[PDB]
Nucleic acid binder design. Structure first.
Length: 168
RNA sequence: AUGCCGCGGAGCUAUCAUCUGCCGGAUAACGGCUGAACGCCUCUAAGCCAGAAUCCGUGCCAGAAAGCGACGAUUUUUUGG
C-alpha cells in the first residue's frame, strides 16, 4: 500500500494537507482527519502504522482512498451525466449556477449554485442531458446531488439520474 | 342639588372609525455528498450540504439612575477663576 505519483505531479505534506498540482489545475483538501504518520518518498506515498486500534484500519484506508482521488484529479476530469424525466422541463442559466423551470408545472423557479471548480456547460449533444464536470470529486458530486435534492416531488412518475465517468 | 327636550363645535373615544405589523444565522426530525472499517455494500468514522411555526440575532421598546464617547461655552475689566 504505497501509492505512486505520476509525471508532472507535486505532492506536498504540510499540517496534514494535500495540495497536488496539475495542468488541469490545482485541487487541494484538508486531511486533518487521520492520526497516522505520512511519509513522502518522492515518487510514492506510504502510510506506516504502529500498533494501531481497529479505527486505525479505517483511517489508513480513508486517507489512502482520498489520496487516490487527488492523483486522478491531476489531469483527468469527473464528468457526470444528468437526466431529465417527465409537462416538459427546461434549463436556462449562465455560469456556475443552474436554474430549473416547469418542474411538473410549478410556478416556482429554483436556483442551484455549484461549488468552486464545478462548471456546467449546458450540453446539447442529446435530448435532456446536461454534463457537469470539474476536478474536485467532492464538489462535483455535491453540486450534482444538490440539483437532484432540490428537484423533489411531494405526495404520490419519478425523476432519475444517469451514470458517471471521466473526461480529459 | 346640572329642571326638562332638539341640535350642538372642541376634546375624548369605537374591531361602531381609520392607519401600520420584516429577513438573516444555527439547528431538530429527516435526507443527500466525499468516503471507510468489515478489501463489497452503506448519509458517519472526520467532514461537507440541505432542512421546521424550533433556537439565536438584525428590526421594535427600555437604556446601566456607580457603562461610555464627540462636541459647545467656561462666574469678566467689581470679585471669583
Amino acid at each position: 500500500e504505497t501509492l505512486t505519483i505520476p509525471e508532472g505531479v507535486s505532492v506536498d505534506i504540510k499540517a496534514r494537507l494535500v495540495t497536488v498540482k496539475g495542468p488541469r489545475g490545482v485541487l487541494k483538501q484538508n486531511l486533518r482527519r487521520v492520526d497516522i504518520e505520512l511519509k513522502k518518498q518522492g515518487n510514492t506515498i506510504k502510510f506506516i502504522v504502529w500498533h494501531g486500534s481497529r479505527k486505525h484500519n479505517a483511517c489508513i484506508r480513508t486517507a489512502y482512498s482520498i489520496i487516490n482521488n487527488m492523483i486522478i484529479g491531476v489531469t483527468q476530469g469527473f464528468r457526470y451525466k444528468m437526466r431529465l424525466v417527465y409537462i416538459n422541463i427546461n434549463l436556462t442559466e449562465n455560469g456556475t449556477v443552474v436554474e430549473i423551470r416547469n418542474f411538473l408545472g410549478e410556478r416556482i423557479t429554483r436556483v442551484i449554485k455549484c461549488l468552486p471548480g464545478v462548471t456546467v456547460s449546458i450540453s446539447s449533444a442529446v435530448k435532456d442531458e446536461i454534463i457537469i464536470e470539474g476536478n474536485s470529486l467532492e464538489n462535483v458530486s455535491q453540486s450534482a446531488a444538490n440539483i437532484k435534492q432540490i428537484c423533489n416531488v411531494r405526495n404520490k412518475d419519478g425523476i432519475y439520474v444517469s451514470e458517471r465517468g471521466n473526461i480529459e
